[PDB]
Amino acid sequence: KQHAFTREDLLRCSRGELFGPGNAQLPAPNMLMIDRIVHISDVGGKYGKGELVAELDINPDLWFFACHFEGDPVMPGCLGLDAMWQLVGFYLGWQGNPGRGRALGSGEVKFFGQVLPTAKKVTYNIHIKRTINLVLAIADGTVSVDGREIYSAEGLRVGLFTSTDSF
Amino acid sequence: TKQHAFTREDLLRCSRGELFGPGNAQLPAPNMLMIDRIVHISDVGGKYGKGELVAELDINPDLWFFACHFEGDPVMPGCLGLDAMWQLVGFYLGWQGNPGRGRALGSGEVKFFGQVLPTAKKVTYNIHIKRTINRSLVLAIADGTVSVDGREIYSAEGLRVGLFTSTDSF
Ligand SMILES: CC(C)CNC(=O)COCc1cc(-c2cccs2)on1
Fold this sequence. Notes:
Pathway (chain B): Lipid metabolism; fatty acid biosynthesis
CATH class of chain A: Alpha Beta
Shape of chain A: globular
Pfam families (chain B): FabA
GO cellular component, one term (chain B): cytoplasm
Distance between the termini of chain A: 31 Å
EC number (chain B): 4.2.1.59, 5.3.3.14
Oligomer: homodimer
Helix content of chain A: 10-25%
Radius of gyration of chain A: 15 Å
Bound molecules: ligand IBK
């Protein structure tokens, strides 16, 4: 029903309190790689099967700049990638499906730019390609920094797992 | 290229730029460093006859990510096991004696089909080098798998990492 979420909405999700116990949670800091969801719907997008647009605000004091790497700070790609998985999981829970979320993998992933600590904002664009009903979603995603496209991922997969679902 | 294993302190020295020198490959420091030790690294043998790395990360409930991922449902993030494999392929490139800073370039298929719970003992990475290209930029292509206490849980085909004597373009 709701098409945008604030950081507090996301934190409430991370405690299990948005979609309920046993259903999809975002991670909490410092794994949470999203500050807000600017748009989420289940129509339109590249494939007509939905879209998310999310943001993460950047400043030099974010933890990962210190350790990755000393004398050469850059946001880790894996974390931008996980953002995209986090977002596809959120989608599944937001649609009203039950169960806990797990990334199942992707096809191609490409990194061709970087998020430096002089950046202002990272934006994720996720396009849902298919939902299969175990319940799972396939999407493409890109990551951008102050307007500039830097990562891409094809065929991101996230599944949801109930009481009766095992890895 | 002489040394075929590294301790955690070797890896921490690498992370400060002090194993391979300034401007060459570094591992990340904690809490992004996802390896405790490299048990075997060589540039012959492996699946493809072009080299192999075997590395370990020790698991205990205390590791930071278990608290936040997720509350009431701790599990190691897959992205971090993935990054371990990139981190390792970068180390290989520096260990071969090439210059420049490392950047993950991407991969083909990745599959997650198991998980690391905080009751696990040890995660093990096995990386097989498929190709190193030295033609203009220096880069590596490898397959990898991740295992937890003997059980294979992730796979990655076509991991790519490059070295850059000049990243300024990105
Ligand atoms: C898909 C093929 C073209 C790979 N792409 C390239 O050749 C372009 O350069 C790679 C690059 C990567 C990064 C980052 C890596 C990790 C965090 S940021 O910053 N520049």
